[PDB]
Design an enzyme around this catalytic site. Sequence first.
Site, PDB file in Angstrom:
ATOM      1  N   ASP A   1       0.830  -1.312  -0.055  1.00 42.64           N
ATOM      2  CA  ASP A   1      -0.284  -0.254   0.252  1.00 42.64           C
ATOM      3  C   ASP A   1       0.655   0.981   0.441  1.00 42.64           C
ATOM      4  OD1 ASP A   1      -1.802   1.959   0.192  1.00 42.64           O
ATOM      5  OD2 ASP A   1      -2.862   1.045   2.366  1.00 42.64           O
ATOM      6  N   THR A   2       1.064   1.929  -1.038  1.00 41.54           N
ATOM      7  CA  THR A   2       1.751   3.167  -1.584  1.00 41.54           C
ATOM      8  C   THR A   2       0.909   4.388  -0.948  1.00 41.54           C
ATOM      9  OG1 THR A   2       0.557   3.655  -3.393  1.00 41.54           O
ATOM     10  CG2 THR A   2       2.450   2.590  -3.054  1.00 41.54           C
ATOM     11  N   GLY A   3       0.065   4.540  -0.249  1.00 44.55           N
ATOM     12  CA  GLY A   3      -1.085   4.859  -0.039  1.00 44.55           C
ATOM     13  C   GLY A   3      -1.062   4.405   1.966  1.00 44.55           C
TER      14      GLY A   3
HETATM   15  C1  017 Z   1      -8.966   0.256   3.853  1.00 48.27           C
HETATM   16  C2  017 Z   1      -7.792  -0.102   3.178  1.00 48.27           C
HETATM   17  C3  017 Z   1      -8.145  -1.505   1.893  1.00 48.27           C
HETATM   18  C4  017 Z   1      -6.887   0.895   2.120  1.00 48.27           C
HETATM   19  N1  017 Z   1      -7.623   1.873   1.139  1.00 48.27           N
HETATM   20  C5  017 Z   1      -6.163   2.682   0.267  1.00 48.27           C
HETATM   21  C6  017 Z   1      -5.109   2.558   1.602  1.00 48.27           C
HETATM   22  O1  017 Z   1      -4.356   3.430   0.636  1.00 48.27           O
HETATM   23  C7  017 Z   1      -5.653   4.347   3.203  1.00 48.27           C
HETATM   24  C8  017 Z   1      -5.451   5.404   2.198  1.00 48.27           C
HETATM   25  C9  017 Z   1      -5.607   6.343   3.316  1.00 48.27           C
HETATM   26  C10 017 Z   1      -4.565   7.348   3.211  1.00 48.27           C
HETATM   27  C11 017 Z   1      -5.192   8.768   3.974  1.00 48.27           C
HETATM   28  C12 017 Z   1      -5.755   8.513   4.891  1.00 48.27           C
HETATM   29  C13 017 Z   1      -7.001   7.984   4.579  1.00 48.27           C
HETATM   30  C14 017 Z   1      -6.761   6.419   3.842  1.00 48.27           C
HETATM   31  N2  017 Z   1      -4.391   4.190   3.999  1.00 48.27           N
HETATM   32  C15 017 Z   1      -4.461   4.407   5.335  1.00 48.27           C
HETATM   33  O2  017 Z   1      -5.847   3.966   5.576  1.00 48.27           O
HETATM   34  O3  017 Z   1      -3.564   4.562   5.463  1.00 48.27           O
HETATM   35  C16 017 Z   1      -3.476   4.862   7.294  1.00 48.27           C
HETATM   36  C17 017 Z   1      -2.141   3.599   7.961  1.00 48.27           C
HETATM   37  O4  017 Z   1      -1.668   4.142   7.754  1.00 48.27           O
HETATM   38  C18 017 Z   1      -1.650   5.919   8.109  1.00 48.27           C
HETATM   39  O5  017 Z   1      -1.013   6.558   6.384  1.00 48.27           O
HETATM   40  C19 017 Z   1      -2.660   7.267   6.481  1.00 48.27           C
HETATM   41  C20 017 Z   1      -3.664   7.630   6.713  1.00 48.27           C
HETATM   42  C21 017 Z   1      -2.874   5.965   8.029  1.00 48.27           C
HETATM   43  S1  017 Z   1      -8.471   2.235   1.396  1.00 48.27           S
HETATM   44  O6  017 Z   1      -8.740   3.720   1.630  1.00 48.27           O
HETATM   45  O7  017 Z   1      -9.942   2.147   2.637  1.00 48.27           O
HETATM   46  C22 017 Z   1     -10.161   2.670   0.177  1.00 48.27           C
HETATM   47  C23 017 Z   1     -10.702   1.554  -0.417  1.00 48.27           C
HETATM   48  C24 017 Z   1     -11.434   0.881  -1.548  1.00 48.27           C
HETATM   49  C25 017 Z   1     -11.370   1.881  -2.364  1.00 48.27           C
HETATM   50  N3  017 Z   1     -12.133   2.355  -4.139  1.00 48.27           N
HETATM   51  C26 017 Z   1     -10.469   2.918  -1.990  1.00 48.27           C
HETATM   52  C27 017 Z   1      -9.876   3.220  -0.945  1.00 48.27           C
END
Ligand code: 017
Lengths: 99, 99
Positions: free
Chosen positions: B25-27
């Site tokens: 997960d790059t996010g």
């Molecule tokens: C729940 C997972 C399947 C991850 N997902 C994407 C992910 O990159 C999120 C994307 C993301 C990024 C920032 C804020 C909210 C969501 N990352 C995230 O939640 O990061 C949290 C954990 O590490 C910290 O980094 C920042 C937030 C914390 S998701 O947001 O829920 C998602 C699922 C399906 C779609 N179509 C679009 C997005």
Amino acid sequence: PQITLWKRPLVTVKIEGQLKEALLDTGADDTIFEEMNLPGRWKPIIIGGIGGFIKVRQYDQILIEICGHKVIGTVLVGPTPFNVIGRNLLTQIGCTLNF
Amino acid sequence: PQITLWKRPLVTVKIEGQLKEALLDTGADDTIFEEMNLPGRWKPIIIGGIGGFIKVRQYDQILIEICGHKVIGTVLVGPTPFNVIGRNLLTQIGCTLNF
Ligand SMILES: CC(C)CN(C[C@@H](O)[C@H](Cc1ccccc1)NC(=O)O[C@H]1CO[C@H]2OCC[C@H]21)S(=O)(=O)c1ccc(N)cc1
């Protein structure tokens, strides 16, 4: 371009004449954006993530220009804390993870 | 290896003798996993996502083996719907996005 991961992979995108930074998210199946208006009809949907679910407006065939590259695809609009470019669009630019 | 994004970037992981698939997960800034026991003490923290927030137990200096590559870093344990490998660990293998 090659992108390292020492800082958040933000990129500037052009969508509906609007300039926005977006997060290249390999963990996102689909592309979602903060509130903004877009063309065409839309379906309401609910997406699931970390912490729960959110209702968003679903739009198809949306033009986004991302770092000089053009793509069209589904774009969801809802209360995301950040704009993310999900895999539905990352593929069309031939984006890849590499290690 | 080169990884395309037409399917979720899942990888098999070895962590504390446990085998798990994890999402590159790059996010994700940080690495989080579903509930599991790990050695030692932990600190309670709250992380933010698209759907909301969740409390997780924070562990530092955690060994994870990912597709033949070894890394040590912070790994959070909580009610994530998926295990994700965040940037805190993606860097150590020199993972990059490429298009
Ligand atoms: C729940 C997972 C399947 C991850 N997902 C994407 C992910 O990159 C999120 C994307 C993301 C990024 C920032 C804020 C909210 C969501 N990352 C995230 O939640 O990061 C949290 C954990 O590490 C910290 O980094 C920042 C937030 C914390 S998701 O947001 O829920 C998602 C699922 C399906 C779609 N179509 C679009 C997005």
